[PDB]
Amino acid sequence: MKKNVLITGGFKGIGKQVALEFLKNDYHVCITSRYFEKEKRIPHLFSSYEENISFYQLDVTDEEQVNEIINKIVKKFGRLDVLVNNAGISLSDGLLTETKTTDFNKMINTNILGTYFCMKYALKHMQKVSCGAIVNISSITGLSGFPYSILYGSTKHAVIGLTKGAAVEFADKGIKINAVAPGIIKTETLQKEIDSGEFSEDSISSIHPMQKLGTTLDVAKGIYFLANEDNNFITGHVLSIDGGYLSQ
Amino acid sequence: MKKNVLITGGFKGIGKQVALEFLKNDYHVCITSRYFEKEKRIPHLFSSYEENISFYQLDVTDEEQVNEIINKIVKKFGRLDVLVNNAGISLSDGLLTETKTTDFNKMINTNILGTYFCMKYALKHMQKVSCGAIVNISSITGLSGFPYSILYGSTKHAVIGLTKGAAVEFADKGIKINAVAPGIIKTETLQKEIDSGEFSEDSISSIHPMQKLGTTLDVAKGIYFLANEDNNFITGHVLSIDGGYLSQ
Ligand SMILES: NC(=O)c1ccc[n+]([C@@H]2O[C@H](COP(=O)([O-])OP(=O)(O)OC[C@H]3O[C@@H](n4cnc5c(N)ncnc54)[C@H](OP(=O)(O)O)[C@@H]3O)[C@@H](O)[C@H]2O)c1
Numbered sequence: 001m002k003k004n005v006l007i008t009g010g011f012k013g014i015g016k017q018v019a020l021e022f023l024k025n026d027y028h029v030c031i032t033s034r035y036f037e038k039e040k041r042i043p044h045l046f047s048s049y050e051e052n053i054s055f056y057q058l059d060v061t062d063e064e065q066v067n068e069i070i071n072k073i074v075k076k077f078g079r080l081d082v083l084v085n086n087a088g089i090s091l092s093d094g095l096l097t098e099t100k101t102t103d104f105n106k107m108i109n110t111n112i113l114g115t116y117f118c119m120k121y122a123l124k125h126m127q128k129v130s131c132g133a134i135v136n137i138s139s140i141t142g143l144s145g146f147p148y149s150i151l152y153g154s155t156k157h158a159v160i161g162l163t164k165g166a167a168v169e170f171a172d173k174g175i176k177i178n179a180v181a182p183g184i185i186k187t188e189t190l191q192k193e194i195d196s197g198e199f200s201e202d203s204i205s206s207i208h209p210m211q212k213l214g215t216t217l218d219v220a221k222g223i224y225f226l227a228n229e230d231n232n233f234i235t236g237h238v239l240s241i242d243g244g245y246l247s248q
Numbered sequence: 249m250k251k252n253v254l255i256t257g258g259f260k261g262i263g264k265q266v267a268l269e270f271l272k273n274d275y276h277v278c279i280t281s282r283y284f285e286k287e288k289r290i291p292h293l294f295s296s297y298e299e300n301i302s303f304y305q306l307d308v309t310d311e312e313q314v315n316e317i318i319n320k321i322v323k324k325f326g327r328l329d330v331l332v333n334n335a336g337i338s339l340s341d342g343l344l345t346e347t348k349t350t351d352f353n354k355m356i357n358t359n360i361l362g363t364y365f366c367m368k369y370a371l372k373h374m375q376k377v378s379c380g381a382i383v384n385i386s387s388i389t390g391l392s393g394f395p396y397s398i399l400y401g402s403t404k405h406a407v408i409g410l411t412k413g414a415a416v417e418f419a420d421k422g423i424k425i426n427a428v429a430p431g432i433i434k435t436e437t438l439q440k441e442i443d444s445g446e447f448s449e450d451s452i453s454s455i456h457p458m459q460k461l462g463t464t465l466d467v468a469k470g471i472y473f474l475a476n477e478d479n480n481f482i483t484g485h486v487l488s489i490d491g492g493y494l495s496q
């Protein structure tokens with residue numbers, strides 16, 4: 001009876017807040033981790049929402065598993081209203097000439113191929129019912145040049161390419177496909193790097209015109225807006241959630 | 249007491265639906281017309297919301313009147329949470345070589361100067377309280393070249409310039425300033441232009457990848473999202489509401 005959303009992730013950072021936002025809006029939420037040990041955290045991370053959450057172990061770089069997991073979800077729930085491609089990694093070295101090819105391949109595998117696999121199998125099902133929403137997560141580095149994050153940015157550019165291409169291809173099938181482009185977001189990972197003193201909050205906050213960091217809630221709200229049933233006419237679009245970064 | 253929004257318009261087309269959207273979300277709404285006689289329509293257009301609506305006669309091309317009306321609103325309500333620059337005109341002729349300078353100046357006056365005047369005086373007030381949101385209405389023609397709508401397109405490009413410029417300028421002052429870029433929207437005006445027979449619906453909807461026209465609700469929903477209290481980190485952005493038009 002509830003709309004059903006799959007988030008690649010859900011246990012930390014942006015993904016957890018995305019899960020919470022859909023839960024607060026009466027969705028059934030499928031969340032994932034590579035680690036089966038995370039399933040037991042559910043009643044404690046999402047106190048009152050436990051009954052509306054389903055766990056799946058999933059590595060998005062494993063195409064066969066992506067197909068299996070999405071098939072399982074469709075079989076169990078008989079619907080797949082929304083896919084949120086949250087899973088992503090950033091392996092930041094130094095300048096381009098010092099970067100490791102193994103790092104770039106890992107980012108490609110997770111950020112590009114993982115998003116591609118999830119789209120590919122989600123769309124096979126969404127096509128049949130001529131409805132659904134996909135929201136991909138890019139970055140400001142997906143729309144501009146960012147020193148020391150060139151390779152990550154390249155993958156996030158590629159994500160935008162998958163978003164716009166798929167959008168145009170599936171536009172007449174009533175499926176919406178959009179992306180968000182967050183600026184620097186204060187996740188748990190960043191908060192502890194600030195708390196360990198070796199990273200000044202104001203130092204990184206200053207790259208945004210708004211002179212503050214983004215929150216996981218800022219991102220979750222944008223994703224929810226693009227995904228919900230009241231989105232009838234927005235597709236192929238990249239929503240910047242960046243404190244004004246891309247406008248200068 | 250209630251959040252207060254000013255819309256330049258409110259009696260027809262996109263502007264009416266924007267009023268309705270803010271009303272449904274518990275705002276007090278100031279709506280305007282150049283024509284004082286429209287005020288008596290309010291109990292009939294907005295049956296159950298009449299108590300939460302205030303009428304102001306306003307021509308946005310008259311800078312003195314813009315300053316007067318915004319001052320009167322702030323004096324009476326003691327707040328101005330949101331400004332929506334809805335007022336705009338399209339005077340289409342033929343190719344660029346056949347266009348009338350008088351038509352261009354009219355569009356410049358309403359679409360560029362009107363938006364600028366309202367921003368200018370709204371920001372003098374919002375600056376004082378370090379909060380507020382402005383949503384401007386541009387167009388897909390503000391982000392692409394559109395034969396036979398070159399002059400209108402030029403004014404809507406200019407709107408984006410005002411949007412991005414002010415966003416960066418006021419970002420550190422807590423004020424959000426964004427725009428929407430709608431595709432072709434089925435308003436009352438368009439509905440009857442299809443009814444006359446000069447246009448087929450399928451004919452003009454075919455320019456959008458989604459193969460349908462946008463609605464006034466589509467636009468109102470996008471505007472509300474950018475304007476509401478839960479937008480903390482989106483500024484300087486142009487939200488496309490165009491059935492995928494700009495993604496091709
Ligand atoms: N943080 C930022 O400032 C920022 C800015 C712009 C964009 N983004 C993007 O936003 C998304 C979320 O970032 P975040 O900072 O919230 O990340 P995070 O806190 O590091 O969490 C990463 C999430 O992705 C999952 N994941 C990673 N690799 C996976 C794989 N191979 N298969 C399945 N799941 C995998 C993790 O699941 P398990 O570890 O439980 O398996 C976890 O849920 C990413 O795409 C990121 O690039 C982040």
Ligand SMILES: NC(=O)c1ccc[n+]([C@@H]2O[C@H](COP(=O)([O-])OP(=O)(O)OC[C@H]3O[C@@H](n4cnc5c(N)ncnc54)[C@H](OP(=O)(O)O)[C@@H]3O)[C@@H](O)[C@H]2O)c1
Binds near residue numbers: 259306387429
């Ligand atoms: N319709 C579309 O497909 C479309 C697409 C992209 C963008 N837009 C833009 O969206 C906005 C609304 O369009 P719409 O189609 O809803 O327009 P509409 O139905 O023609 O309504 C025009 C509105 O603008 C007001 N207005 C016009 N000139 C004014 C002036 N000099 N001073 C104050 N108010 C003035 C009118 O008020 P009174 O007549 O009551 O004085 C009315 O409320 C415009 O900026 C338009 O360019 C529309």
